[PDB]
């Protein structure tokens, strides 16, 4: 959770973090790509029957 890792609970921080653009969107997109591939890795090795 980008907002909870950086800021952490505080709410005055959230308005400041929005000023850096879409860095938190990039982190979620990048990690989702990994998360989807890791299940496909397993299906390709074992689900051959």
């Amino acid at each position: 959770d980008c907002t909870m890792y950086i800021c952490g609970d505080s709410t005055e921080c959230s308005n400041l973090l929005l000023q850096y653009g879409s860095f938190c969107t990039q982190l979620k997109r990048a990690l989702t790509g990994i998360a989807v591939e890791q299940d496909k890795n397993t299906q390709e090795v074992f689900a051959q029957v």
Binding site: T3, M4, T32
Partner: protein
């Protein structure tokens, strides 16, 4: 509508789309310190005979 605003699109194809977050704010601001505490008797200096 939150999903459509996350994707920046008006068509959402099939699948899970991790969007917001979910934290459960607090309510009580329970504070605490020490039972201790001497006093310094102003009393003496504000009540001498």
């Amino acid at each position: 509508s939150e999903t459509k605003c996350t994707l920046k699109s008006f068509t959402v194809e099939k699948g899970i789309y991790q969007t917001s977050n979910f934290r459960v704010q607090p309510t009580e601001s329970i504070v605490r310190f020490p039972n201790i505490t001497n006093l310094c008797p102003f009393d003496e200096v504000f009540n001498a005979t």
